Structure formats: structure tokens, C-alpha cells
């Protein structure tokens, strides 16, 4: 009845999906609600902020280097002076994809609030480097155009009248005035569809043979004269209208799917083909979880930008970075008011310590305890196929793809399946009966995520097992009563 | 020679202004850089991350307070989960604009990570009501399209040629096209000169602002049908999905929304019948001498944004307070709504509220000391300052053009856009003051210290602008401008 100002739908949603429980304290894999009692019931965290705790909710490591930076009286707000931090993280993140690409490429960093915001930094500097191309290109045309004038009036050669579809002083006007309507249209963002990133196109990840079609149709020609010793004609010459192509690496939102090698190369050919930039957005991976730093590296993806979020918070603050390659760089670009903060650099740079730690033994962990999680989800898959169609991602960045309940005998599940939500109703049987928290991704909601801390253990893991079956068990036996709450 | 990762030209470009200092520690309104012997030097700190300081670098209570939640095991992550403090946050939030303005007006709250974040909520929430408001209009169009077409075929009216430059069937699709190429058309959004948070508005000249917005006016079209004849009319399609204004503009020096602006964007809101967005991100919370710039200079916003000082000078946070009546619920990102930057905003929402809001009347009165203490210097260096603006302890001084400088040194830099940072160098090296500048020729000096900032310290401050402002008055480039 009382007074509401804030979350009034999101609480009454998440109730009657069985999610409406409050955390109370986090401490590793665990996080903990209070019951009617007042007592605290541990819940196994599978979703750790959708793959941010890579270290588990506040691991005591990140915890001490943050109470140590706060008493240390870290400058956390010095915009405008020399903070050598962001260089030193730049390093070791320059050594890092060196170490895991082959490649000897140098990227500057650009450090931001939040991925989108990484994203963003990377969309403005292509659109700057389209914008030389542009220049560079009218410039061309513009001494073409004069070169053809003087030589119509000097009657050295004669506009063939065929390319006139597309006097003399009026068709450069005419011509100026058509390349003028292109160089005001916007930019264009490649991107795949089941990503978003901060006047786009979202195009088949699925069917890449369909990719090379679909960005043929947006090629655009601006207008200029060829002279060719006797003769002047008006010819197409190739606008550059993609800014950029982006690619996540391991797409969240089409439950967890790692770029193909055959779309790997359908992405290298249409950025060597176009020539804008190819932006790797890791943002939303969570660095080592895919069992290396860069996925990029992983699955072999050649990236000239790379952004990260994910993990480098040490999940307790906020820091992306956009990494842009030293010889396209720009530096016309070079900040905001949060971004680039003391706290978070200091945070940075004790996730990195910890990750490369011990001749990369953390990426050895991550990459085991992902082959122990990967190969428990397809035991499961293979008992359960009525209801599991695929698993999905790579390292401790896993899935289950459900198959559709739209169909479904109980009118129960058949109106969730319907609405979008089963993932989020099979979640609350999970909590609910299991005391295990598992979120679901994809737009229907048709996956459940895996994306645990590298400290999981095979104890953990079977209880996810006992409780996927059970799970599974009551979606074959369409018991909407027991699945879906009233 | 080596290899450089990061910051090459900003580091190059500080160094060559008298910047290229690095804070080592920070506490109160002093940060401290290393001399050559390796002794810490305190810097008096104006800047304040451009006044995201309100109570200075690293008070103890938000260290304490982050400290006690971080040994508590506070859950940051916890994504579609029961999270009280957001509704905790709003409460105490709806509460100071209910008393700063009178009004009993409830916000719902929408948390991001940052101020960009909070307007751009702020955009798509405005633009979800204008297409709201075509929906409505479109379908009306359809009702009054029918109602002329069973009337013209009925013989009861006849279609009046005279509209006609803007048989029936016909007309009915090539008016249903001129209306599909306006409502696929982009949003409108009004800002002011001054800000970016699209089209930017003379806040100085606010006469000329209804012009402008009136020439923005687009028609659809529909069949009024009268009787015994039917007319094709144009109606009113709603272009701007939404207003925003800054109170304080720090990008035009600190200047404050004038009462003849503030009643400007009151009637372009009441008008067009979309939002007024009161963005106070880049204000910081009480700095003006109320917690609402917005309530201080009488904005009456259907929106409101913040996020400086929200982090208590360690964490980022931001929140969009949109009115519950409007509010569409369709709307309600991972690091959004976090346990650790949530515990902290309560934290510093209970200090500035603290003892019948006290911190307000001290901000007050350490703005009017600062202010004071600006003007008189003012007074005597009315050659090379113009102005003081701002309110509270949101203060800038406007620098005269130097771009006609007898001395090349200053001149050049007045001519790059440098000045406002060369004068800073000054201050830095002869005076161990930190300022920067504000707005786009750099031609402000910007003062947004902590509530706590000393007459002591106040005192230094108008020692070292004599000094700087005899040096510019002298035209001596030469101690102004590194070499």
C-alpha cells in the first residue's frame, strides 16, 4: 500500500518469478539471504556478476589493497597531472596481448567509467579516422574536378555525354552538390546481431556466407570527372561509409557463443576489404574467465581497437579501458571527471598482479575448472535432451541453451515460455529448492549462465549436477506447480 | 626515447603549461606532490575533481564507512535481486526536493555509473513519452481519415480544393506518407550553449530562444471534416522530446540559470509538453548552498539527474529521478545499482544532511567569504578579470581576451586556447595552489574547494591572484610562460 521510490516493478517481477530473495553478505562463491528466522542460508553464485568476480565476491586480497589504498590517502580526483598508473596498467596490458597474440603491436590506453563508455571512446576515434579518409578522398576529387575543367575549356578532350545519368561549371556544382548529401550522412557500425555496443546494423554471426551480401548493399559511390587524355567521363569512386566492425568475442546475449573461426575470417576480410577498424569488446567477458586474458587471443580474433570492464573492478569499483593501436592512434582524443580515478588504478593494477601470478597459473585454473563445469553441463545435456538443446561458451563462460516451452502441456509454463521469462522461472526453482543462484541470458530468456569464480569446487560443482537434474527432471514432467509459483 | 603505453601527449602538454606535478597523497583540500629532495610539498586543491570534493579528499567518515562495509562482506554484485538501499536512496532524495521546493512531488530512481549515463535514461525515457504522444495523435488521424471518407463517398460534404497543395483514395495515401517521412524523423532535444549532456540555445539572449524553438514547429496532416465540407488541415507533431538544463553551467564558466532563462524553459516546457531535464551531475550535491541548484535558482524540472559527490570522493555513482505520475515502467547495466557505491551514497546523504542541514548554512557562508575575497581581487585587476560567477563554493573568475598580449610568450597562448592552464602553472609553482580552468578558451579560473576550506587558506588564495594578476598586468610572459 505505502510509498514506493524506487523498484516497484522490478521487486513485484523478480517475486513472482521466485527471485525476490535480498543478499545480506557475499564471501567467495557464496552469497547470503536471511529466512523467516532471521538466519543466514548460503546460495552457490553462478551468476557473480554475470562473470565479473572471476576472484569471488570480495576476495580478502582486493579487500586489504583497497583498505591499504583508502588509508594510504590515494588520490582518487586528479584530473589534469601526471598519474603514471594509467601507463603502468597500459604496460602490462600491451605485455599481456603480446604474450598471448604472437604479435609486437603497441596500443595507447583510454581508461572510461563503464564498457559503453569503453565502446563509445573506440566509435568516436574510428569516426575520426573515416572523417581523414573523407578528407584525404574530396581532396583527390577536388584537384580531378579542376585538372577536368581545364582541359574541357582548353578543348583538349569533351565530356562524353553518356555518363550523364549521374555545360561544364554546373555539372561540378551538380557533382558538388551530390557528394555534399553523402558526407553528411551518418556513419555506420558493423556489429553482430545478439550484441549491442554503446546508426548501426546488426548482421547473421550464424550465416557469415549472408554477411559479405549485406554489407555489399550499403557500399555508396560519390562523383567525380576521370580525365583520360582525349576524353572526360563522370565516374563512381567508393565512399567509405562502416566506421567500424565490432565484435564480442563470446556473445552474452545469444547465450554465450564463441565467434566461429569461419566468421573469424568473415570479420579480417571485411575489415582488410573496408578498411575502418576492427573493435574487439571483451567488456562483457571478464579477463582470464575464457581461460586466457583476451579471449580475442583465444579464438584467434586480430583486433586494431580492444576495450575491457569486466573483473578489472576486482568487483568492488568500477574501470574499463579502450586499447587503440599506436600507429592509427590519433591523438586529437587524449578525458571525463570519474574516469582515470586513483582508487580504481590502484584496484587495477592488484587484479593484474593476481592474474599473472605465478607464470599465469590462474589461467591454468580457470581453463580445468571449466573443463570440469563444461563436461558436468554436457552429462547433464545428454540425460536431458528433451529440454537442453546445446551448451554453449568456453572456460568458466558456459551456458545451457533450454529448448522452447511455448508448447508446453501446464498453462503455467506455457504463459511464462510465452512472456519471455522460463530461464528466470527455472532460476527460482533453482534458488528456491537447491539454494543455488543462476540467472538466465538470450532475449526469450532461453539460456541459464555458468560464469562461477576459478575457485569453485567439485563439491560445488555436483550440487549444480544433483540440482540441473532435479531442475530438468520437473520440466519433463511439465509440473508447472512446482516450477512456477501460485 | 622509450616506449610510452599511455598519456604522451596529455603528460607533454601539462609539462609545458607548469602541470606535469604527480599527486602522490591527498587528505582535506591539500593533495602533495615529491620535490627533487623527496619531501612531500602541500598543494591547496581548488579543483576538487571539479567540485566532486564537497568535503574534501578522503574525509575519514566515507574512508571509515567504506572500510566497515568492505570488512562486512557487502554484496556489490548482486544483479535482479531485493536491493533496499536504492529505494532507501530515492526516499532521502525525494525528501530534500520536497523540502528545498515546497512541492510534494514523488521521483522514481534510476541508478548508472555515470552523469551521461544518468541524462541518457533521462533522453530514452523522454523519447519513450513522445512516441507515447504520436501513438495517441496517429490514431486520432486514423478515426478523423475514416470519418472523411464515410462522408465524402456518403456525398454528405465535398472536398474543398483549396488545401489541396499540401480524388480521395489517393489523398488518403499521400497523406499517410507525408506523416510516415515526419514520424521516422529523429528526436529533438533542446540543450543551452554551454553544455553537452540535438540543439544548443542562446541561454544569455532568452527572447531570441522562442524563435528558434518556434521555427523547429512541424505539422502532419489529417481531413477535418466540418458539415458540409471536408478540409486537409495541419496539426501539431511533436518534435522535442525533451528540455535539459545545467543550473550552474561549468562550460560557460560557472554561470548561473538567470531568473529570465529559468521562466523561459518553464514556458518552452508547459508549450511543447515534454520534460524539463534538470541535469545537476557536474554540480556536486550542496555546493551551491542547497543540496538543488535547481530548488536554490527556482528550475522546476519534471526530471532531475546527479552523480559528483554521490562517491564521496572514492566511488562513481549516479542516479535519474524521473516524476512517478509520468513515469513509464517499461524502463528500470552490471556495474548499476552496486552494494559498495549504494552504502556509500547513504553515507554521504546522512552527512550533508546532518544537524538540520548545517552543511548547507556552512557552504553558504565559506561561498560568501570565497566570493568576497574574488570580487576584491576583482576590483583591483579589472584589467585582466572581467567577472566573477557562480554561487556557493561553485565560484569561477572570467579572464580578459589575451590574444592581442604585447608579450608573444602569453599571446600564443591566448591565441591556442591556453591561457586559463598557463595561469595555473603559475599558481602551482610560485604559490602551491592548485587551480584549473573552466570553459572553451580556457578564460575561466575555477574555485570548488571542500566546505572546510580555512580563512587561512582563503587568504593564500588572494595573496597568490594579486601576484598572478600584477605578473599578467605587467605582461611578464616570461614568468608566466615556462621556456
Redesign the interface.
Known amino acids: 500500500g505505502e510509498?514506493?521510490?524506487?523498484?516497484?516493478?522490478?521487486?513485484g517481477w523478480?517475486t513472482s518469478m521466485g527471485?525476490?530473495?535480498?543478499?545480506?553478505?557475499?564471501?567467495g562463491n557464496t552469497?547470503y539471504y536471511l529466512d523467516d528466522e532471521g538466519r543466514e542460508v548460503p546460495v552457490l553464485d553462478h551468476?557473480?556478476?554475470?562473470g565479473?568476480?572471476i576472484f569471488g565476491?570480495?576476495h580478502p586480497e582486493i579487500?586489504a589493497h583497497?583498505?591499504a589504498a583508502?588509508?594510504?590517502?590515494?588520490?582518487?580526483?586528479?584530473?589534469?597531472?601526471?598519474?603514471?598508473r594509467?601507463?603502468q596498467?597500459?604496460?602490462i596490458?600491451?605485455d599481456i596481448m603480446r604474450r598471448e597474440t604472437g604479435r609486437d603491436d603497441?596500443?595507447?590506453?583510454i581508461f572510461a567509467?563503464?564498457?559503453?563508455?569503453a565502446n563509445e571512446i573506440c566509435m568516436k576515434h574510428a569516426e575520426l579516422e573515416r572523417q581523414e579518409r573523407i578528407t584525404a578522398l574530396f581532396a583527390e576529387i577536388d584537384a580531378e574536378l579542376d585538372t577536368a575543367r581545364e582541359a574541357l575549356t582548353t578543348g583538349t578532350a569533351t565530356l562524353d555525354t553518356a555518363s550523364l545519368p549521374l555545360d561544364v561549371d554546373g555539372v561540378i556544382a551538380d557533382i558538388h552538390r551530390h557528394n555534399d548529401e553523402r558526407r553528411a550522412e551518418r556513419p555506420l557500425f558493423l556489429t553482430l546481431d545478439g550484441s549491442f555496443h554503446g546508426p548501426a546494423r546488426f548482421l547473421p554471426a550464424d550465416e557469415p556466407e549472408l554477411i559479405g551480401k549485406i554489407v555489399e548493399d550499403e557500399r555508396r559511390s560519390v562523383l567525380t570527372l576521370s580525365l583520360d587524355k582525349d576524353t572526360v567521363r563522370v565516374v563512381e569512386r567508393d565512399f567509405p561509409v562502416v566506421a567500424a566492425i565490432f565484435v564480442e568475442p563470446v556473445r552474452g546475449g545469444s547465450g554465450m557463443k564463441t565467434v566461429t573461426p569461419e566468421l573469424a575470417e568473415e570479420l579480417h576480410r571485411l575489415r582488410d576489404t573496408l578498411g575502418c577498424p576492427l573493435v574487439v569488446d571483451e567488456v562483457?567477458t571478464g579477463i582470464g574467465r575464457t581461460g586466457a586474458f583476451f579471449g580475442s587471443a583465444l579464438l584467434g580474433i586480430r583486433g586494431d581497437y580492444y576495450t575491457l570492464?569486466?573483473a578489472i573492478?576486482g568487483?568492488?569499483?568500477?574501470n574499463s579501458v579502450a586499447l587503440i593501436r599506436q600507429d592509427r592512434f590519433l591523438?586529437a582524443m587524449?578525458?571525463?571527471?570519474?574516469a582515470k580515478?586513483g582508487?580504481?588504478a590502484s584496484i587495477a593494477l592488484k587484479v593484474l598482479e593476481m592474474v599473472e601470478a605465478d607464470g599465469g597459473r590462474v589461467y591454468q585454473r580457470v581453463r580445468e575448472r571449466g573443463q570440469r563445469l563444461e563436461a558436468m553441463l554436457e552429462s547433464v545435456r545428454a540425460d536431458h535432451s528433451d529440454v537442453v538443446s546445446a551448451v554453449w561458451g568456453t572456460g568458466l563462460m558456459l551456458a545451457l541453451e533450454l529448448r522452447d516451452q511455448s508448447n508446453a502441456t501446464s498453462q503455467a509454463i506455457r504463459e511464462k515460455a510465452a512472456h519471455g521469462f522460463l530461464g528466470?522461472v527455472l532460476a527460482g526453482f533453482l534458488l528456491r529448492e537447491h539454494h543455488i543462484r543462476v540467472?538466465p541470458a538470450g532475449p526469450r530468456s532461453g539460456f541459464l549462465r555458468f560464469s562461477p569464480s576459478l575457485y569453485i569446487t567439485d563439491e560445488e560443482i555436483d550440487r549444480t549436477e544433483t540440482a540441473l537434474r532435479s531442475l530438468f527432471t520437473a520440466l519433463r514432467d511439465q509440473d508447472g506447480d512446482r516450477l512456477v509459483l501460485s
Not at 3 to 11: F, G, I, K, R
Not at 19 to 27: D, H, K, Q, T
Not at 334 to 338: G, L
Open positions: 510509498p514506493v521510490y524506487a523498484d516497484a516493478v522490478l521487486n523478480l527471485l525476490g530473495v535480498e543478499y545480506v553478505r557475499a564471501e552469497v551468476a557473480c556478476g554475470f565479473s568476480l565476491h570480495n579487500i583497497a583498505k583508502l588509508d594510504a590517502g590515494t588520490v582518487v580526483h586528479a584530473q589534469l597531472s601526471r598519474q603514471p594509467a601507463n596498467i597500459s604496460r596490458l600491451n603497441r596500443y595507447n590506453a567509467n563503464s564498457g559503453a563508455e562483457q570492464a569486466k573492478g568487483g568492488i569499483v568500477k591523438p587524449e578525458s571525463s571527471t570519474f580515478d582508487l580504481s528466470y540467472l
